[PDB]
Amino acid sequence: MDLVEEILRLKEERNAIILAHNYQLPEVQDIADFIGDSLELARRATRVDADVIVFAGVDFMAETAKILNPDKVVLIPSREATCAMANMLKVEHILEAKRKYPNAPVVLYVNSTAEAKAYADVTVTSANAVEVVKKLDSDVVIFGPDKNLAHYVAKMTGKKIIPVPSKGHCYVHQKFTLDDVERAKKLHPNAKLMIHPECIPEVQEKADIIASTGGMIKRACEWDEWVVFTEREMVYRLRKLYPQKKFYPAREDAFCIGMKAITLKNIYESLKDMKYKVEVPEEIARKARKAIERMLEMS
Template sequence: MIKETAIERELIEKIKELKEKKGYTILGHNYVISELQDLSDITGDSLQLARLATEIENDKILFLGVDFMAETLKILNPSKKIIVPTKGSTCPMANSLTPEIIKSFKEKYPNAPVVLYVNSTAECKALADYTCTSANAVEIVSKIDSDTILFGPDKNLGSYVAEKTGKKIIPIPGETGYCYVHNRFSVEDVRKAKEKYPNAKIIVHPESSKEVRDLCEYIGSTGQMMKFPKEDETEEFIIGTEIGMIHKLPKTFKDKKFYPLKELGICNNMKKNNLKNVYEALLNEENEINLPEEIIEKAKIPIMNMFKLMEG
């Protein structure tokens, strides 16, 4: 357990006071720092947060994560005020795909539906047929009535979906689309971790490379990772995802042990959210997420298509 300093404790108290006084609900992704996870009313993965976004009654939300997630919240809640601690928390993988790239692939493959991982910008979502998350990508693609799919921006998740569905997945933007945090896990890391913790099962995120996935016992989104230790008798797990999960898992499963696959599994962008900028954002109610109406309308369609397929 990380001990907070006196300054941090003071900030935490001030944040709690401001949140109550100004009436904000705080939503935090599983990858934000542990102090912010503890301050959040709800923590979850992209899918959990996207779904919850449609159910929150409060019209003021402080979102802790990266920009494409805050945009998704805004798309699903256009009338709500959504603020973030910093506008600088972005996702290089989401940014690797642009509307121009999607348009050029659509021209080349006019009959292939476009499925975009929610880790994409609102402008790109506005050009997609469906969105998906790492938790439901296999389900969504298998339910679409087409054998060829344009899938982006994560080539690793795309290859996982191809493996599981048997469909032809054309990755967009291609080799440049990956999450640097998950793509960094190597076969050597898995070998070393297995040597160090011989009784542990290795769980990795589908954003990891195929070589790494093939050596692991379980592949799942962070939401699915939160369920697996309950279903499995094993007492020790090596976790191959962003280090933030090493805070959440032991809190939930107190009798089990969790080790990071690699200490360097850190998303620097998520870590740009900190106590100081959370406090300032609440104090000044600043860094509001705004999107053009047209983008909101268009980007909502593939998200709702995802929800429909999940219900069907």
């Protein structure tokens, strides 16, 4: 494909940087200027000197980048790139919890809607949720939208966690079952199990290490053979970072359809047409920024 070389000429003449999440297609990872989890992506978005950000991720991640860079152009290659977990949390869920627990801080995953983040005291990802919640003064915390991460946070902080909404979860990581753990140990007897904290608690209890995708990268040096309980394209990421090690997905069907809405072709069309421009209403942007900034400073 001359498509790769044409993306690179376009981004260079646009003064653009391509930021990509770890779950992006291999073709997208191979052209990205930076690849990381959502916390690393949020951090990288605070030191962008480029004029344009092309965000190879889901729409609410791109909105976070826009909240952190209101002066810059942020493009999402497809407006259908979205997070099913984040869409489960409505503002009314938060207000109801705030009425019932008036002194609980509101702690939302950074991928939530900008409207929901406007009601957060602080945001988190899987990478920093325990560290942030531990620092909060209150013993009661409103937390969402992922109930499986909420379970993990309650276990690691000892605090009372009120999940909002009740059914919030990521369907990709919810796919994993104890049956998949048992099958992994038979297929790969010498491997260790990396499990993401968005998996269900009984699956997490089987892990050798429980870690966000950034944590999986930091801890892969502890063993040479891993079975990976997270989204399929993280296995590609690990294999390219560590060619000398062995990695295997726990389920080949554990893939995020929203992440896969971004392709090499619509990144090219994104740079060619300067679309689609990400905008956040000023009122909502300002309130969400305060919680995202608190997250960065508390991490």
